[PDB]
Ligand binder design. Structure first.
Ligand SMILES: CC(=O)N1CCCC2(CCCCCC2)C1
Length: 460
């Protein structure tokens, strides 16, 4: 039975509006409704992994698990195994997988983050799950961010608190937040970004939705505009939205948007918005292709419609050689030439690099770089030809070309990371000097760049 080099992943996000679901929710898991939908010819083909994020979920874990498993069994005649379930207040994540994957999945982690302070601490935040699938690390975040059209900055702050403090993946990756710990990271939920148009335009917006003319609405979507201004979700992808706004509906129909201010809304308008979203970030040059992104039309218990997204995702096998794991493979090496970090910092400390990768026995610390002044004010940290030669555990190119090197640039004075990034070993050539590049972030914000050349030696 061969190990897969691709899997498909279903991501669902649904704000249930504190109401039990209807008796049938299969359209959700089938990616049927509006938007980029799944072909009918695939209906019986199970996804490998289903990740379900709910918000305002009134069910017990037991009650929801029974609905989800019975739904998937009806669709596929497969009894899915529960990988993980984690709930913070009414925010929940469930991971289910085909039984054949049970001994491919390990290192399962769960965590939550509570956002806000005092007033604003008590119902918003995120839950997450991570695990290894053979040689590939997968992370999943379900977040319910701050509501209200005039709170986009709060949502952006909630995002930064979640990526800083959610403790998933390999704890040995200590300089790295969740935006660098996984081969594939999926972040979804009721992100609560709104269509920023005047209140007086509510009926105009509704008209546009009825005509399936989303362009003038998406150009005011706060998540798209904040992402384009690099205020949030830097280096994450989202599929094009081709489904109607998923909020705020009258319950028990989808024929009506309920947008007017009411005591129940705190006297706030809820103009039709794409609150419910799926985004992802994968390591460079790993296969990830969105195969559906849309909303259901037939699940009407909530004032939100469920959202689905499906992905093909590249995976790798748990590689064993005669040599590594448990030793190095002298036929392998990674060299770095003409490397320099450009940092936005106003500080003057010495810096060194750390290289982290599961292709190394442990992380590698460089010598200090040489600081110069850039022509436009910047700090340039020159490593020249001074970086160590990295010694991978396995030299086989079928393994090594699929790996990645995480880079942290740290202050010698404080040992705090000023920037993190990632370099793919999926090179055009081996034994050849080739350009490399990564942006550097810290707390998910741009802090600089790392560039230079790489020379990769494999056993071939
Ligand atoms: C690959 C990627 O994610 N990019 C590059 C192209 C522009 C951006 C995507 C379009 C939506 C708004 C954010 C800007 C970001």
């Amino acid at each position: 039975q061969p190990e897969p080099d691709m899997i498909t992943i279903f991501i669902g996000t649904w704000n249930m509006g504190n109401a039990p679901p209807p008796k049938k929710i299969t359209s959700w898991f089938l990616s049927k409704g509006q938007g980029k939908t799944r072909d009918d010819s695939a209906d019986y083909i199970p996804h490998d992994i289903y990740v379900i994020g709910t918000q305002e979920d009134p069910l017990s874990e037991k009650e929801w698990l029974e609905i989800l498993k019975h739904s998937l069994q009806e669709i596929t005649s497969v009894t899915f195994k529960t990988v993980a379930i984690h709930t913070l207040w009414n925010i929940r994540i469930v991971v289910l997988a085909k039984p054949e994957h049970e001994n491919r999945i390990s290192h399962i982690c769960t965590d939550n983050v509570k956002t806000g302070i005092a007033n604003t601490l008590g119902n918003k935040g995120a839950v997450g799950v991570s695990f290894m699938f053979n040689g590939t690390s997968l992370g999943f975040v379900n977040s319910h961010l701050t509501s209200g059209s005039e709170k986009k900055l709060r949502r952006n702050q909630n995002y930064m608190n979640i990526l800083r403090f959610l403790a998933l993946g390999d704890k040995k990756l200590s300089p790295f937040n969740i935006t660098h710990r996984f081969t594939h990271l999926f972040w979804f939920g009721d992100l609560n970004y709104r269509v920023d148009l005047p209140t007086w335009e509510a009926e105009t917006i509704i008209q546009k939705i009825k005509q399936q003319q989303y362009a003038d609405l998406l150009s005011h979507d706060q998540l798209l505009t904040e992402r384009r201004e690099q205020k949030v979700f830097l280096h994450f992808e989202e599929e094009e939205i081709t489904f109607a706004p998923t909020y705020r509906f009258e319950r028990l129909t989808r024929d009506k948007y309920a947008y007017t201010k009411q005591k129940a809304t705190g006297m706030k308008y809820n103009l039709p918005s794409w609150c419910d979203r799926v985004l992802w970030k994968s390591y460079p040059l790993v296969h990830v292709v969105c195969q559906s992104y849309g909303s259901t039309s037939d699940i009407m218990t909530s004032d939100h419609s469920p959202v689905f997204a499906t992905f093909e995702a590249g995976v790798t096998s748990q590689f064993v050689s005669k040599n590594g794991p448990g030793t190095v493979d002298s036929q392998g090496q990674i060299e770095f030439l003409r490397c320099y970090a450009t940092l936005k910092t106003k500080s003057q400390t010495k810096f060194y690099l750390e290289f982290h990768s599961s292709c190394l026995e442990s992380f590698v610390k460089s010598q200090e770089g040489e600081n110069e002044e850039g022509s436009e004010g910047e700090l340039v940290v020159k490593f020249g030809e001074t970086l160590p030669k990295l010694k991978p555990i396995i030299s086989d190119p079928e393994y090594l070309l699929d790996q990645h090197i995480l880079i942290s640039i740290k202050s010698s004075d404080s040992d705090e990371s000023y920037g993190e990034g990632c370099i793919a070993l999926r090179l055009e050539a081996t034994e050849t000097q080739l350009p490399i590049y990564t942006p550097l972030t810290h707390h998910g914000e741009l802090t600089g760049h790392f560039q230079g050349e790489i020379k990769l030696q494999t056993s071939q």
